[PDB]
mmCIF file of C-alpha atoms in Angstrom:
data_model
loop_
_atom_site.group_PDB
_atom_site.id
_atom_site.type_symbol
_atom_site.label_atom_id
_atom_site.label_comp_id
_atom_site.label_asym_id
_atom_site.label_seq_id
_atom_site.Cartn_x
_atom_site.Cartn_y
_atom_site.Cartn_z
ATOM 1 C CA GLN C 1 -0.194 -0.634 0.200
ATOM 2 C CA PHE C 2 2.747 2.471 -0.590
ATOM 3 C CA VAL C 3 0.411 4.888 -2.564
ATOM 4 C CA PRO C 4 1.286 8.260 -3.744
ATOM 5 C CA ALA C 5 2.378 9.943 -0.752
ATOM 6 C CA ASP C 6 -0.335 13.028 -1.770
ATOM 7 C CA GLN C 7 -2.814 10.450 -1.911
ATOM 8 C CA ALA C 8 -1.776 9.511 1.675
ATOM 9 C CA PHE C 9 -1.073 13.235 2.997
ATOM 10 C CA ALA C 10 -3.496 15.725 0.973
ATOM 11 C CA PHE C 11 -2.738 18.686 1.224
ATOM 12 C CA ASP C 12 -4.588 22.724 0.403
ATOM 13 C CA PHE C 13 -5.056 25.808 1.465
ATOM 14 C CA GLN C 14 -7.386 28.467 1.799
ATOM 15 C CA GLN C 15 -6.879 32.176 3.223
ATOM 16 C CA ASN C 16 -9.060 35.199 3.553
ATOM 17 C CA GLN C 17 -6.799 38.439 3.990
ATOM 18 C CA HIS C 18 -4.991 37.678 7.635
ATOM 19 C CA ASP C 19 -6.145 34.264 7.788
ATOM 20 C CA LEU C 20 -4.708 31.431 6.612
ATOM 21 C CA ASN C 21 -6.216 27.814 7.464
ATOM 22 C CA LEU C 22 -4.201 24.910 6.386
ATOM 23 C CA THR C 23 -5.158 21.441 5.752
ATOM 24 C CA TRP C 24 -4.278 17.443 5.072
ATOM 25 C CA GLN C 25 -6.913 14.915 4.651
ATOM 26 C CA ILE C 26 -4.810 11.421 6.278
ATOM 27 C CA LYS C 27 -5.890 8.485 4.853
ATOM 28 C CA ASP C 28 -6.324 5.702 7.569
ATOM 29 C CA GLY C 29 -3.219 3.816 8.241
ATOM 30 C CA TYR C 30 -0.769 6.873 7.203
ATOM 31 C CA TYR C 31 0.021 9.215 10.115
ATOM 32 C CA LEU C 32 2.032 12.625 10.467
ATOM 33 C CA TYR C 33 5.567 13.276 13.155
ATOM 34 C CA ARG C 34 4.370 16.577 14.633
ATOM 35 C CA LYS C 35 8.196 17.344 14.746
ATOM 36 C CA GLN C 36 8.726 16.985 11.781
ATOM 37 C CA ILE C 37 6.240 19.537 10.579
ATOM 38 C CA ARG C 38 7.844 23.174 9.288
ATOM 39 C CA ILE C 39 6.345 26.593 8.110
ATOM 40 C CA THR C 40 8.443 29.246 6.752
ATOM 41 C CA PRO C 41 7.659 32.165 5.748
ATOM 42 C CA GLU C 42 8.788 34.293 2.756
ATOM 43 C CA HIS C 43 8.484 38.195 2.301
ATOM 44 C CA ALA C 44 5.517 37.778 5.237
ATOM 45 C CA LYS C 45 5.106 37.979 9.011
ATOM 46 C CA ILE C 46 2.889 35.393 10.667
ATOM 47 C CA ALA C 47 1.995 35.027 14.193
ATOM 48 C CA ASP C 48 3.935 32.258 15.887
ATOM 49 C CA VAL C 49 2.582 28.932 14.787
ATOM 50 C CA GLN C 50 0.923 26.438 17.743
ATOM 51 C CA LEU C 51 0.696 22.472 16.271
ATOM 52 C CA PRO C 52 -2.210 20.874 18.229
ATOM 53 C CA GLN C 53 -2.359 18.035 20.524
ATOM 54 C CA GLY C 54 -1.759 15.269 18.833
ATOM 55 C CA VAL C 55 -1.611 10.313 19.792
ATOM 56 C CA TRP C 56 1.056 9.009 21.076
ATOM 57 C CA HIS C 57 3.003 6.477 19.093
ATOM 58 C CA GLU C 58 5.630 3.951 19.029
ATOM 59 C CA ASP C 59 7.383 2.698 15.113
ATOM 60 C CA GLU C 60 11.250 1.136 14.743
ATOM 61 C CA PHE C 61 12.031 5.021 13.381
ATOM 62 C CA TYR C 62 11.661 7.790 15.891
ATOM 63 C CA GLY C 63 10.733 5.383 18.804
ATOM 64 C CA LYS C 64 7.774 7.433 20.486
ATOM 65 C CA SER C 65 7.048 10.249 18.394
ATOM 66 C CA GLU C 66 3.049 12.735 18.902
ATOM 67 C CA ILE C 67 1.393 11.681 15.859
ATOM 68 C CA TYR C 68 -1.140 13.474 13.161
ATOM 69 C CA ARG C 69 -4.210 10.623 11.763
ATOM 70 C CA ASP C 70 -7.396 11.885 10.414
ATOM 71 C CA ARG C 71 -6.838 14.936 9.703
ATOM 72 C CA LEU C 72 -4.132 18.071 10.678
ATOM 73 C CA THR C 73 -6.239 21.504 10.819
ATOM 74 C CA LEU C 74 -3.774 24.643 11.539
ATOM 75 C CA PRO C 75 -4.609 28.212 11.393
ATOM 76 C CA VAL C 76 -1.854 30.577 10.276
ATOM 77 C CA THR C 77 -2.194 34.514 11.124
ATOM 78 C CA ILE C 78 -0.940 36.264 8.118
ATOM 79 C CA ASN C 79 -0.080 40.263 9.374
ATOM 80 C CA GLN C 80 1.705 41.347 6.556
ATOM 81 C CA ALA C 81 1.778 39.891 3.408
ATOM 82 C CA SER C 82 4.098 41.772 0.195
ATOM 83 C CA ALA C 83 2.778 41.050 -3.528
ATOM 84 C CA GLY C 84 4.093 37.321 -4.007
ATOM 85 C CA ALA C 85 4.885 36.441 -0.617
ATOM 86 C CA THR C 86 4.793 32.442 -0.329
ATOM 87 C CA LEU C 87 4.874 30.110 3.061
ATOM 88 C CA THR C 88 6.519 27.079 3.016
ATOM 89 C CA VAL C 89 5.335 24.509 4.655
ATOM 90 C CA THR C 90 6.793 21.059 5.130
ATOM 91 C CA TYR C 91 6.138 17.986 6.844
ATOM 92 C CA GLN C 92 6.181 13.866 7.150
ATOM 93 C CA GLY C 93 4.524 10.999 7.350
ATOM 94 C CA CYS C 94 4.465 7.179 7.916
ATOM 95 C CA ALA C 95 2.401 4.329 6.629
ATOM 96 C CA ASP C 96 1.105 2.070 9.382
ATOM 97 C CA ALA C 97 1.583 -1.079 7.086
ATOM 98 C CA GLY C 98 5.819 -0.903 7.446
ATOM 99 C CA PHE C 99 7.333 2.899 5.517
ATOM 100 C CA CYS C 100 7.729 6.223 6.259
ATOM 101 C CA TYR C 101 7.625 8.870 3.094
ATOM 102 C CA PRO C 102 10.874 11.448 2.864
ATOM 103 C CA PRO C 103 9.733 14.531 4.004
ATOM 104 C CA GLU C 104 7.616 16.344 1.323
ATOM 105 C CA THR C 105 7.641 20.861 1.212
ATOM 106 C CA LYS C 106 4.903 23.025 -0.445
ATOM 107 C CA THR C 107 4.979 26.027 -1.345
ATOM 108 C CA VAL C 108 1.689 28.366 -0.278
ATOM 109 C CA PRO C 109 1.212 31.414 -2.601
ATOM 110 C CA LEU C 110 -0.043 33.897 -0.242
ATOM 111 C CA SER C 111 -2.520 36.362 -0.975
ATOM 112 C CA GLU C 112 -0.962 40.249 0.189
ATOM 113 C CA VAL C 113 -2.289 41.395 3.188
ATOM 114 C CA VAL C 114 -1.194 45.492 4.741
ATOM 115 C CA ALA C 115 0.500 45.110 7.903
ATOM 116 C CA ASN C 116 -1.238 45.277 12.018
#
């Protein structure tokens, strides 16, 4: 069951001005590592991102780790974003079947936002 990474972890975003929501639809039997998520803005300023509380799991890769299953919803606050600004979103997930996908990076185009 080594399906394409984007089928196991369906990533999408929706922005309404200062509010950005990042979503991952996580196929049953797969999970994301909380600690492997990285969000980096380029030409934009965002509020601190608080990763939500997940569940604890144990595997041979990292032993005891906090993971996310089913779906991950992550709100992000854009305080300022110049034209052409982007958000680099990196994450990594594995399959209960016994294998991990490599980290994946998505570039989110941010709509311009005037500060404050």
